[PDB]
Design an enzyme around this catalytic site. Structure first.
Site, PDB file in Angstrom:
ATOM      1  N   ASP A  35       0.827  -1.197   0.000  1.00  0.00           N
ATOM      2  CA  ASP A  35       0.000   0.000   0.000  1.00  0.00           C
ATOM      3  C   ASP A  35       0.866   1.252   0.000  1.00  0.00           C
ATOM      4  O   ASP A  35       1.357   1.673   1.043  1.00  0.00           O
ATOM      5  CB  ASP A  35      -0.892  -0.011   1.240  1.00  0.00           C
ATOM      6  CG  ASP A  35      -1.806   1.186   1.313  1.00  0.00           C
ATOM      7  OD1 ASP A  35      -1.937   1.906   0.302  1.00  0.00           O
ATOM      8  OD2 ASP A  35      -2.409   1.380   2.387  1.00  0.00           O
ATOM      9  N   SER A 199      -0.559  15.631 -12.045  1.00  0.00           N
ATOM     10  CA  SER A 199      -0.809  15.277 -13.430  1.00  0.00           C
ATOM     11  C   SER A 199      -1.048  16.536 -14.247  1.00  0.00           C
ATOM     12  O   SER A 199      -1.563  17.539 -13.738  1.00  0.00           O
ATOM     13  CB  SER A 199      -2.018  14.346 -13.513  1.00  0.00           C
ATOM     14  OG  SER A 199      -2.427  14.098 -14.844  1.00  0.00           O
TER      15      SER A 199
END
Length: 330
Positions: A35, A199
């Protein structure tokens, strides 16, 4: 040193991925959920409340000659999906794919929430976010990666998740045969303890690319892709009959649909998520309403590039002094 381990979807939907991990001496192999959105290595154990164990493999520290109680240490964690676990702490030898760390904090669960009990395939979590998020008190502990780092050939790990198929976590090297083209690296902020990056935009299907900054985290422990409501609405508007359902808890679409791809930007590069990766199948057995793999982050407080996004790429988690993230097509 290096390590290389195969990671395998837990079910037909790729809800999560499990990777075998050797703990203790002699080895006890547990299948852990790696994770990159948390920083605790915790396991079902001989200490876990009996009624909360249902099929998981447990770690038994009393059977490990290298286990030592970390005296006075406790831990307690809550995840984004509302699940939680807590307990006490041992140090022991932990190996992943041939890479060994001695003195790793292994957090033994005394209690786990129902979602963990109900998932018989997940024996615990191995956190790979920054150690500043680790919950052990009063002495915060380091992640497996942080402990391994100095010994690694290169201070990196990579995630290569499969779509309805096994994939790989590598530590200490970049497998240049595992991706196509070049890797595009992008800046990371560690201010919130995550692999947080920005992004450069998105496209829906064959549509034009929208240049827009989207701050989010690379999180292997989250199933879906959670993005701003504007972006998500633009995606689902291209699917006839798709709608946001408050009763179901997100966007659903007719199971008869063919889903468009979704592209996200990494610098001037582009990662394309095929439409099929965005299909999570019927909301309930036999239903003709299917659950979407792109959902709104509104109310989470952060955008999350979860498995839906990451499995479309070869992803480098570069833990150099100034960390960065790399993405390549594959």
């Amino acid at each position: 040193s290096t390590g290389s381990a195969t990671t395998t979807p837990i079910d037909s939907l790729d809800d999560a991925y499990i990777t075998p991990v050797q703990i203790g001496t002699p080895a006890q192999t547990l299948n852990l959920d790696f994770d990159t959105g948390s920083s605790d290595l915790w396991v079902f154990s001989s200490e876990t409340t009996a009624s909360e164990v249902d099929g998981q493999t447990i770690y038994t520290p009393s059977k490990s000659t290298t286990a030592k109680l970390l005296s006075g240490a406790t831990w307690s964690i809550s995840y984004g999906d509302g699940s939680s676990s807590s307990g006490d702490v041992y140090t022991d030898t932990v190996s992943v794919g041939g890479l060994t760390v001695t003195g790793q904090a292994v957090e033994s669960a005394k209690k786990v929430s129902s979602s963990f009990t109900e998932d018989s395939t997940i024996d615990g979590l191995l956190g790979l976010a920054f150690s500043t998020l680790n919950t052990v008190s009063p002495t915060q502990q380091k992640t497996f990666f942080d402990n391994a780092k100095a010994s690694l050939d290169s201070p990196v790990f990579t995630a290569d998740l499969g779509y309805h198929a096994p994939g790989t976590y590598n530590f200490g090297f970049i497998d240049t045969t595992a991706y196509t083209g070049s890797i595009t690296y992008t800046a990371v902020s560690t201010k919130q303890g995550f692999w947080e990056w920005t992004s450069t935009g998105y496209a829906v299907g064959s549509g034009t690319f929208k240049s827009t900054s989207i701050d989010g985290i690379a999180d292997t422990g989250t199933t879906l892709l959670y993005l701003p409501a504007t972006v998500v609405s633009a995606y689902w508007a291209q699917v006839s009959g798709a709608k946001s359902s408050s009763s179901v808890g997100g966007y659903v679409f007719p199971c008869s649909a063919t889903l468009p791809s979704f592209t996200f930007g990494v610098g001037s590069a582009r990662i394309v998520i095929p439409g099929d990766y965005i299909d999570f199948g019927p909301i309930s057995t036999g239903s003709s309403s299917c659950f979407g793999g792109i959902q709104s982050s509104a109310g989470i407080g952060i955008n999350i590039f979860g498995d839906v996004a990451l499995k479309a790429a070869f992803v480098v988690f570069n833990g150099a002094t100034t960390p960065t993230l790399g993405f390549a097509s594959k």
